[PDB]
Structures are given as structure tokens and as C-alpha cells.
Amino acid sequence: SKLKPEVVEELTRKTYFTEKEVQQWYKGFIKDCPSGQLDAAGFQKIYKQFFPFGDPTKFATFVFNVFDENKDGRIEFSEFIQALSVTSRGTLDEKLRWAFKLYDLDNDGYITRNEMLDIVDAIYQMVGNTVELPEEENTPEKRVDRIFAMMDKNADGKLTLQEFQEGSKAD
């Protein structure tokens, strides 16, 4: 597991990691994925280990496809480390820009309510829901209805990156 110096330096520059951290992430990545390429089955295996009695199929697939920047069916180290940099160390605006790419499942530039429900449902499918009274059930649908309506300031049925990035931010 030896990364070429020019690659280490470029991936350093492109991320929030120090050169040492990039090499440490590579050593662990190659330890777990000796070919240097993580596939979708191995990506879902990670989530099933977290939540062995949820169903992570949907969430893992949605996130995998976003992480797989060149859509070759594999997460390579360059993809791995740039994805980890933004999702773990980004600013709030950068983390939400990443999340917008995830939620915008058909890549038409907007988040529609069905798309927000697909992600939220994927999440609850994997990790579960908070047990509640049958009259106050924590259904993704009613949660999405609330949040989606709050963020759709112009009520056109669709969310821009700007509408989304302002969702938890206070004024």
C-alpha cells in the first residue's frame, strides 16, 4: 500500500486532510479493500454491520452512486478521500451542497418532495424510527411534509440549492 508522492500531494491539496492523514486513510482503505476499489456490495456490508436489523439497501445505494463520481461502479481512493473530506470536514454550506447532490436523485437541479421522501425513508429503513403513539406516528411522510413546506419559500413544489441550504440556518 504505497501511494505515489504526486498523488498524495494532489489529494492533500484537494481535501481538508494533511499529507499524513491522507496516507493513513489510504493504508486503512487498502487494508480493508486490497484492490483499492470498493464495490456496492462491500459498501452495503459496512451499513449492515452498523444496523444488522434494518435494511440499508436503499441508503447505501443512493450514497454509493454519489460517491462514485465517474460512475464506473467502484469507489477508488481518490473518490473515497474527497467524499470523506467533504462529508466529515466540510463547512455547513459544503456539507449541504453534498447532501443536495444526494437528494437530487434525478439530477434535474431541484429536490422534489418524492425525492426528499426517498432519502428520509431510506434512512428510517436502515436505522429505524422513534416509537410513538399511533396518533403521533413518526412517519417519513409527515416529517417530509413539514420540512419540505418550510423550505419551499416560493411554494412551487420544488427545492433549489439555495432553499435547501437555508433550512436549519438561523436569521
Binding site: 459496512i46 470523506l84 428520509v120 434512512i123
Partner: peptide, 28 residues
């Protein structure tokens, strides 16, 4: 006690954290 961040489910932050944690598990 609810998981701290799942209040952020639907806002983007929950997905981001879960994504990050999967990558961290993939490299440890």
C-alpha cells in the same frame, strides 16, 4: 433518548453524517 442528529433527517445533515461514518468504517 433519540440519536442526537436524527432531528436533522431531511435537512441533509443526517445523511452526511451517516455517509461519513460509513466511509470511516471502510478505512479502519
Amino acid at each position: 433518548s433519540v440519536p442526537r442528529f436524527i432531528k436533522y433527517t431531511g435537512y441533509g445533515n443526517a445523511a452526511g453524517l451517516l455517509a461519513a461514518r460509513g466511509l470511516m468504517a471502510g478505512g479502519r
